[PDB]
Design a protein around this ligand. Structure first.
Ligand code: NA
Ligand code: NA
Ligand code: NA
Ligand code: NA
Ligand code: NA
Ligand code: NA
Ligand code: NA
Ligand code: NA
Lengths: 313, 313
C-alpha cells in the first residue's frame, strides 16, 4: 500500500562538462547528465522506487539528453516544465594541480522556472526532495521554496544542502536561506564539508543536535571514505565506509540520498510519524543502503548509480 | 605611410564547440576560438596587417582562450570591452547524415555590449569590418550599427553578411536589417549561399550590379571550390578556385575577407577614392590572395588561417 507511493524530486537538472582527451590528443568537454536533485531521482529510479522529477528542462538537444536519461531510469518527469530556453552547463577544468569551474546558467530552462509551473501534489506523493543550487538561484529558488513551504505540513520533506562553492561562491544570504529551509525538512543529509560552510559552533555531533530541534527528525552527515553518521532524537548511528577503487565522486552524495529514501520507502517508514520513532536498526539499514549504493557509483565515472538488479549478491 | 594604418574589426568572438571522439571512444565537444569577425581579425593579424578587434569578451576561461588567440596573432584587442558575463557558445552535432546546431548566447559578454563601450576611432584607422550575427543580435547589434553609421563617411567599411541560418533561423527583419547595412559598406563579400538568402531577383552578376549602385564600390561573391567573382563599376573579375584536400571549411570565408583587405592594404588602396578606381589587375590580386589564403585554412581544421611566412613560395 505504501509501496506505490511516489517520491517527487524537485530541483536542478544540468549538464556536467568534464575534461577528456580526444583521439587527436587534445582537451574536449564530455557532456554528462547531472545535477544533484536530478542524480538523486535517477538513483531512486534505478532502485525501483516510484519516482517523480519536477524541474525546468530545455527542448534543445541537451534537454533531450536529460529526458532520455530520466526515461531510461523510469523516472516520471511529466511534472517538469519544458521551455525553449537553453540547458544549464557546469564546466570543470584541470589547471596545474586543481580543478576550476565555470557555471553557465544565464536565462536557462532550469533557472527561469515560474510559480505557474508548480506541480499538483496529491495523496500518492509520500515524500519530496529539494536541493541547494536550485533553492538558491533566482528566480527558480523562490518557486522551490514556495513548494517546500506549502507541502511541508502534508508530506515527508528531504533536504540536501549540497554547497557548491566552486559553482557559486557562497555568501550569507545563501547560508541564511539554506538555514531557514532546514526548519521545513524532516530529513537532512549533508557532507562534513557541507556542514563546515555553515558557520555554526561546536562538534559535528553537536550541530546535528541543534538541527534536530529545528524540525528535522533525522540528520545524516557523510564522511567520504569513512561512511557516515546518522542522528535522531532517539539514537546516533555510525555507519562505516566501504573500501572500493574510485574513478570519481560525481553524484556520490546523491546516491546516498537515494539509498536512505529507498530503504525507508521499502521499510514503510516514509511518514512523519514513523520518522519520529525510527529504531537504531531502521536508521542503520537506511544509511547502510545509502553507503553501499554509493560504493557502486564512485567506481564507474558517475553520476552513474546502481540498479537494484546490481547489488543482488 | 599607409603601411601603418590599422584595420579595426568589429563583431562577435565566440567558441565553436565541435564534436570529437574521446580516447574512451565517446562524443565530446572540443573548444575552438571562433566567430566570423574574430576569425577575420586573426587572419589579418597573421598576414602582417596592423589589426584591431572591438567586441565584448568575457573574463572567464573561454574569454581567456579568445584573448590568448588574439594576442598570439598580434591583434590589438585593447578596444574590446571586458565583462564578467559568459562567452557565446556555438554547438555543432552530427545526427545521422547532417549537422545540427545549438546557439548558446544568453546574456553573454558579446551580446550585452553597450553604446558606452564604443571605441575611439582616430585617423590611424584606415578601415573597419563588420559581420552579420553581431549586427543582428540584440542589444549588441544596435551598437555595431551605430558605429558603422558614424564611421561610414570617414573610413573604408567592409561588410560580411555571412548568413548563419543554422545558428539563428533568419527572418525578414534580419534580411531587412542586413540590406540597410549594405548601403553603408564600401566592400561587400558574401558567398553564393549567402546571397540566395536575400530574396532578390536575377542573376548573381545582376544582383551585384544593383548593390554597386547602393554605395559599395566592390562586391565579391565566393563560390566554394570554384573560387570567386569580384564586381565593380569598372570591371568583373572571375578568380578560379585552388584544388586542395579539405579537412573542414570553418573560417574559410573569413580568411577570404582577410586576404582581400591585406592585399588592398599592401597595395595602398584602402581609401574610398582608390576603391572607386580599382584596375582589373588590382581587383584580381586582392581576390586571388584571398583565395590562396583560404586554401591553407580549409586544409587543417580551421579557423586556422595562414601566417605570411607560410605562403612564402
Ligand atoms: Na538543439
Ligand atoms: Na539569468
Ligand atoms: Na538552475
Ligand atoms: Na562515479
Ligand atoms: Na572561468
Ligand atoms: Na540575452
Ligand atoms: Na554575439
Ligand atoms: Na579548416
Amino acid at each position: 500500500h505504501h509501496h506505490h507511493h511516489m517520491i517527487l524530486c524537485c530541483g536542478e537538472a544540468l549538464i556536467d562538462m568534464l575534461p577528456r582527451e580526444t583521439t587527436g590528443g587534445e582537451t574536449a568537454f564530455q557532456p554528462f547528465a547531472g545535477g544533484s536533485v536530478f542524480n538523486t531521482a535517477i538513483a531512486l529510479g534505478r532502485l525501483g522506487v516510484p519516482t517523480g522529477f519536477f524541474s525546468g528542462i530545455s527542448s534543445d538537444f541537451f534537454g533531450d539528453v536529460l529526458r532520455d536519461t530520466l526515461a531510461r531510469s523510469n523516472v516520471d518527469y511529466s511534472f517538469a516544465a519544458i521551455s525553449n530556453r537553453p540547458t544549464t552547463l557546469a564546466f570543470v577544468r584541470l589547471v596545474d594541480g586543481q580543478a576550476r569551474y565555470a557555471f553557465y546558467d544565464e536565462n536557462t530552462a532550469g533557472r527561469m522556472l515560474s510559480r505557474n509551473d508548480m506541480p499538483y501534489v496529491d495523496e500518492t506523493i509520500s515524500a519530496m526532495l529539494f536541493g541547494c543550487i536550485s533553492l538558491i538561484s533566482e528566480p527558480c529558488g523562490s518557486v522551490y521554496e514556495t513548494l517546500l513551504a506549502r507541502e511541508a505540513p502534508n508530506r515527508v520533506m528531504f533536504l540536501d544542502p549540497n554547497i557548491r562553492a566552486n559553482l557559486i561562491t557562497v555568501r550569507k544570504t545563501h547560508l541564511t536561506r539554506m538555514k531557514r529551509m532546514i526548519a521545513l525538512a524532516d530529513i537532512v543529509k549533508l557532507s562534513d564539508e557541507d556542514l563546515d560552510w555553515f558557520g555554526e559552533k561546536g562538534s559535528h555531533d553537536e550541530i546535528a543536535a541543534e538541527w534536530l530541534k529545528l524540525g528535522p527528525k533525522l540528520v545524516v552527515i557523510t564522511k567520504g571514505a569513512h561512511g557516515a553518521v546518522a542522528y535522531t532524537n532517539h539514537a546516533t548511528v555510525p555507519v562505516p565506509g566501504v573500501k572500493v577503487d574510485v574513478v570519481d565522486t560525481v553524484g556520490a552524495g546523491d546516491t546516498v540520498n537515494a539509498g536512505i529514501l529507498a530503504s525507508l520507502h521499502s521499510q514503510g517508514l516514509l511518514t512523519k510519524d514513523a520518522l519520529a520513532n525510527l529504531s537504531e536498526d531502521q536508521i542503520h539499514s537506511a544509511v547502510a543502503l545509502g553507503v553501499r549504493a554509493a560504493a557502486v557509483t564512485v567506481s564507474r565515472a558517475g553520476a552513474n548509480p546502481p540498479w537494484a538488479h546490481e547489488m543482488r549478491d
